[PDB]
């Protein structure tokens, strides 16, 4: 069996370092890579770093000077150099899937309460169908990425799923209902026949190995009109 899991999570001061760690279970740290993800309560999910397998670093623009990713050969960790108020977030460690900077494997997440370049357009932000209807999610990119988009699911208080990695390739276990469409700058998930069970926020994301091209979109949050 296949897992990961972030521990580390705690109540800390403004400008306290921390280190969060992630332990894998069933394959290893050698042959994978592992990356960062953060979503601040209720909001969206931000795009942190990655170590490789041979244990080389990138850091979204962002995110340079404000953490540090180490690894062992068990653990990978994640040092948040000066916390701030605005790091206050769950923090997802996640295995790399494919060929770009998507991921297949997440944990359930870490919390960290902190208490004393590409741009992703997703619209719309909310949006119900009825039973069986057909709901339409667009994500602008504002450089072309080619084909380096990833689609993924989170419904409420859980960690995110992939749907979907290279635009339009479905990801193990994922219903045909969903389809993923474009090229370049513009790009849709289309999720037909809605289901009360597809009811959860959906998340583009800019692929691209290349530290000012990886990004979430904002997300969508579909509803199922009763
Ligand atoms: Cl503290
Ligand atoms: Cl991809
Ligand atoms: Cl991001």
């Known amino acids: 069996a296949q897992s990961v899991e972030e521990s580390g999570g705690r109540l800390v001061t403004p400008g306290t370092p921390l280190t969060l760690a992630c332990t894998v279970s069933?394959?290893?740290?050698?042959?994978?890579?592992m990356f960062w993800v953060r979503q601040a309560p209720g909001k969206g999910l931000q795009w942190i770093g990655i170590?490789?397998?041979?244990?080389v670093i990138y850091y979204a623009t962002w995110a340079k000077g404000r953490f540090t990713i180490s690894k062992t050969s068990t653990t990978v960790d994640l040092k948040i150099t000066s916390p701030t108020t605005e790091d206050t977030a769950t923090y997802f460690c996640?295995?790399?899937?494919?060929?770009?900077?998507?991921?297949?494997?997440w944990g359930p997440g870490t919390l960290v309460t902190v208490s004393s370049e590409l741009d992703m357009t997703q619209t719309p932000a909310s949006v119900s169908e009825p039973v069986g209807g057909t709901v339409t999610i667009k994500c602008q990119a504002s450089?072309?990425?080619?084909?380096?988009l990833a689609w993924y699911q989170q419904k409420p208080g859980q960690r995110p799923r992939l749907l979907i990695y290279?635009?339009?390739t479905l990801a193990s276990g994922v219903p045909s209902r969903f389809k993923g469409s474009g090229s370049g700058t513009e790009f849709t998930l289309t999720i037909s026949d809605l289901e009360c069970a597809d009811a959860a926020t959906y998340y583009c994301?800019?692929?691209?190995?290349?530290?000012?091209?990886?990004?979430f979109g904002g997300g969508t949050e579909v509803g199922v009109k009763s």
């Open positions: 170590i490789s397998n041979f244990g």
């Open positions: 069933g394959f290893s740290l050698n042959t994978y890579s």
């Open positions: 994301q800019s692929t691209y190995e290349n530290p000012t091209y990886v990004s």
């Open positions: 450089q072309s990425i080619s084909s380096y």
């Open positions: 290279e635009t339009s």
């Open positions: 996640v295995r790399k899937y494919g060929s770009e900077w998507g991921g297949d494997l």
